[PDB]
From Swiss-Prot, chains A, B:
The gene is PADI4. The modification Citrulline is found at residues 185, 192, 332, 334. It comes from Homo sapiens (Human). GO terms for molecular function: calcium ion binding; histone arginine deiminase activity; histone H3R17 arginine deiminase activity; histone H3R2 arginine deiminase activity; histone H3R26 arginine deiminase activity; histone H3R8 arginine deiminase activity; identical protein binding; protein-arginine deiminase activity. This is Protein-arginine deiminase type-4. Ca(2+) 2 binds at residues 135, 137, 159, 339. It is found in: Cytoplasm; Nucleus; Cytoplasmic granule. Its EC number is 3.5.3.15. Binds 5 Ca(2+) ions per subunit. Ca(2+) 3 binds at residues 145, 148, 150. Changing residue 93 to A: Does not affect catalytic activity. It is linked to Rheumatoid arthritis: An inflammatory disease with autoimmune features and a complex genetic component. It primarily affects the joints and is characterized by inflammatory changes in the synovial membranes and articular structures, widespread fibrinoid degeneration of the collagen fibers in mesenchymal tissues, and by atrophy and rarefaction of bony structures.
Amino acid sequence: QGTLIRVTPEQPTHAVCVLGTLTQLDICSSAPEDCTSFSINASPGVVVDIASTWPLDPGVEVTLTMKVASGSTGDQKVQISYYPVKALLYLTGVEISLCADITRTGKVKPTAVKDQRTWTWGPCGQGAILLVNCDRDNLESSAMDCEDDEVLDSEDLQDMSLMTLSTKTPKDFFTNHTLVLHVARSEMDKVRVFQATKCSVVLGPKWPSHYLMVPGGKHNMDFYVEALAFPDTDFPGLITLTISLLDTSNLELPEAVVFQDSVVFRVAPWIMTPNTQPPQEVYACFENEDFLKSVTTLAMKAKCKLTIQDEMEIGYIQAPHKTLPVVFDSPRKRVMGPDFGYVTRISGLDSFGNLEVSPPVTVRGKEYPLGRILFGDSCYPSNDSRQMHQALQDFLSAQQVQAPVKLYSDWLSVGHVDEFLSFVPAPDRKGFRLLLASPRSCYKLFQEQQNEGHGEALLFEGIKKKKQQKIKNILSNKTLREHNSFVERCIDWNRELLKRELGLAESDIIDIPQLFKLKEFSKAEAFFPNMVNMLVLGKHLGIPKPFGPVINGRCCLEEKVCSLLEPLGLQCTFINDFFTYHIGEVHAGTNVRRKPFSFKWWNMVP
Amino acid sequence: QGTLIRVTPEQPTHAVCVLGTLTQLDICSSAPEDCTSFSINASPGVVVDIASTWPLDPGVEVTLTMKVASGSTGDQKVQISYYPVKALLYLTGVEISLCADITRTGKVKPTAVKDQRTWTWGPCGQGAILLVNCDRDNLESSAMDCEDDEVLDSEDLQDMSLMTLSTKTPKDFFTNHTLVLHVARSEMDKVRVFQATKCSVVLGPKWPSHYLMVPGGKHNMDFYVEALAFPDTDFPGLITLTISLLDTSNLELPEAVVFQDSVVFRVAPWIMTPNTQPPQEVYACFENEDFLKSVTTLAMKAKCKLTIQDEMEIGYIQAPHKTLPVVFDSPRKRVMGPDFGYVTRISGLDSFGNLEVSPPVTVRGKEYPLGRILFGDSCYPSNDSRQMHQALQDFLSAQQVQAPVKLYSDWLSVGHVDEFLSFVPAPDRKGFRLLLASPRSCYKLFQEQQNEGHGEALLFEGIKKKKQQKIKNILSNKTLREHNSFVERCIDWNRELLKRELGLAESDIIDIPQLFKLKEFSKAEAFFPNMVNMLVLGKHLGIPKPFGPVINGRCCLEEKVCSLLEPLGLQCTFINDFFTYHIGEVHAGTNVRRKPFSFKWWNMVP
Ligand SMILES: CCn1c(-c2nc3cc(C(=O)N4CCC[C@@H](N)C4)cc(OC)c3n2C)cc2cccnc21
Ligand SMILES: CCn1c(-c2nc3cc(C(=O)N4CCC[C@@H](N)C4)cc(OC)c3n2C)cc2cccnc21
Ligand SMILES: [Ca+2]
Ligand SMILES: [Ca+2]
Ligand SMILES: [Ca+2]
Ligand SMILES: [Ca+2]
Ligand SMILES: [Ca+2]
Ligand SMILES: [Ca+2]
Ligand SMILES: [Ca+2]
Ligand SMILES: [Ca+2]
């Protein structure tokens, strides 16, 4: 933001000055050796702040400041007299300002002095936000918008960030000078820049620099910027665009740089939405025709739109100008469309049933207003242990805003985290509760009902293909009781893990009755349909119907589940067929889209 | 750091307790439904902090604390009585502490509570330091020490960090329990761990976990840790080792986790040394036999060891226990040895003449006590522009401690930064000065000597193969004067760049007389031997002899160079043949090793 000019008496000096930059003078280096003093006078447009004739000591600082842009080339003068011989200096005032939404308010602001071309997190920080163009507004084009080098629809401009170049110079100022917009060679494959007139490519992959065609006088120019890559292990998420003013008055000599200015964009990360957030839409996809009814009733009850899943997770990206949903598809078919993004980056833990996120929490000082991502892993790497692909773990950690927590889920047969934990909206305290499966909770009910005389109750009743099981001989099973004692020990481990990494007290956790049967390789499957895993649409739940032993009319499992959830204000609605069997895979067909956080992601300091 | 135990009246509960971890009791979950109150008594060794019989409300917190390690299994008891039915709890106190030099003092300290297994920069931060094993103490082995899986010499242990596992448990405690040391699967290729008895590999590449063989009783165990990779774009520089306590009492059931503890190591980065640092050794390598003399005189004068270069840079890595020099070799033969490291990670800007570092500076608040790395680059990427390989730039930025500054040097023919800038030790102010080549400085002398009557002086005098040039017709050359006006404009650009990124005033910069001749493709070579580039060994300089025009006995160029450097207290010693010509490459054979910073790198906060 500075420029040093050296004037000499033998030859007049011509210098360009950009409004907003400090300019100092070097009059000592080329001063007459017999001269011991000097004095300076200049035109009204030129202001001198030097710190009545001065003794030409090297320590003196001659500062120059120009009021406004020049109407002609060298229309401002500076006379330097030595003590006599005079030295001349012809100055031209020009305005070169590169502007972007650095205040994160939706409106473009010029370069303001506190930013210093550095991106900073927080409410008191500065830096523009750039979105990944990962959707498909153009209904005709089947590919992604960022895969080509053209702007097809006007609706696509809403997704791109705006950048303006306003210039006020003399008319004949551009016959010997030139402007060039450029980006680093490492960042060029992540960003593409358009010039609006009607849009053409100036910057992008294999095009790091481009000469600009501007006229003299007062002229502003609009640019539209798009991102082509999410933040990852090889891309922190910053893009820096730069304008440069070059002197080309010498035909034989290469171009000389006179002025540079930059703006720094940050690529918006992918953010998940917890169950506590309101649902915008419910997605569903031969069987369970009656369950489609029970599903449609719940959506109509919770006032949520329904349209006709475990392999994908619906997130979003947001900027001050645009906010749209983006679906992350597991590696284990892309739904691109208007305001619908898509991103893609093999073990059984790579599926997104193993991928969940907590409500906003505060853990021992650190605030997580966007919650924390939760995924499962082994307790320690062995030959027979599984883990989520490192490439996937890196992506989630690269998004930064939602600090991932590694849980233990390798004990389960499937290995997903959603099958032993869940979150529900609560009226008091934190505003939510943590639902954890509990064998101890399930056993207590069965033993209490055995003492109640109804120990002859047969489970699996009213089922087409199932074996009746009595409460009496279920409690008398020494094999099942040992396994559910081992499973409880696993959930207890994760219980204390979540209590520490989410800052949860026991008064925020609710134990839900559930027991498991050991499979081959000592893996764990649910003995009856997993109730802790469900469909949460606000105050309305959609728990799978447990089909537990009938006692005095209604199922005792549902009675306890309701007894724990009704005081929260949660309307329970048990579904006849939530999960379905294949061929040997148990799946669920429901998936939700929820309203993004009101909290802007760029305001937290990771 | 917690563990929740649930006792039941129908069956006694046995529980293991690690000294240092908080333990809470769950007596409500399995309490008799008819019971409304309870009371607890325990052995003297067990301490209860509950917050005179209690009403069994869920909100009550029963906390347990054990004084010391158990001498026998379940030698401490806890009786829980309900109101009556009693529930039992047999406890075993064990000590499992993993220790490392987390205080960065050279001595191993246990896990202290403020660390929380998180590495933190600064004097008030915590975290152990790990060095890359990139040297070769074993004189016989030709390869690097970290390339194999064995500890050959006792001298090699000084380079490795120490980690201890101290355990105090009952004797029969280990027949049903087991300990396992492990590291993440992503970090395993960067670290190798040895167990000392005599050393064997427990952890490393393709070996993420390993069972430990410890006896019962009071027993400590030593581990030696080495790093295998410097921090890069794919490795932030953190390693996390973890110990795990497993329960294996159930033969049929898989191992259950009871306790985990970790230590976090940070891999020490590569640090450069500026000219202001004292020189430990001078390296040199047919011709200029007389110059070897003038070189040996300077080293003997500055009291520095000499032994018989531009393609390599001598840096260092340091830890609280060991500090050794490491040579970074440019991609454009490895000198491994005892306490001599080696690291390696094609354009003409990839050479390390384009790689330099500044003295310790403070720039607008931010402190850089280890200086800042300086390398050259084009002003903007064009088809005909050059740049340092992105892989190289990433490595320097990954070292973090010395923030790299991108300068402009694409104008030069060679393109190196050392041929137009240098640093010298000063007595006052900052303690250093910045030496910049200056055509304006050189022209002023020549014009002043023309006025002095000695304008008939012929340059290139006393040279075997050279053409005589007079000061008169050198100043009268309109071609040379335009080119040195363009070169000055380049150095002036970098001048303001360094003033802003190093926080330098004009009172810290010294202009050195020098001019250049344009070559093909408008590139720049020095017209006479570059003086700003030299050999700085403390107060003693080794400037190349300019062979400038002779005036009244001595060379006027040397007279001005001395006039600027002598007041600093710098003894100038001009060398007859500093640079040599090949075939078309101009090189220098000298290279220096300097004393590392007293400032420990882990104390600054990047
Ligand atoms: C109704 C099915 N069923 C179950 C049952 N319910 C499960 C739910 C999940 C689960 O939560 N997920 C499924 C995988 C993907 C995860 N994202 C979510 C996983 C399971 O085991 C693999 C489940 N099992 C065995 C038990 C049962 C007993 C009788 C009749 N039917 C029964
Ligand atoms: C004595 C040679 N010489 C020079 C001269 N001196 C140079 C030094 C460097 C330099 O600083 N480096 C060399 C490259 C690697 C960098 N790390 C450091 C680079 C140069 O041009 C490429 C130099 N030229 C042309 C000019 C001259 C005139 C007459 C007789 N001899 C003359
Ligand atoms: Ca497009
Ligand atoms: Ca779009
Ligand atoms: Ca859109
Ligand atoms: Ca999920
Ligand atoms: Ca070795
Ligand atoms: Ca070694
Ligand atoms: Ca050594
Ligand atoms: Ca160098």
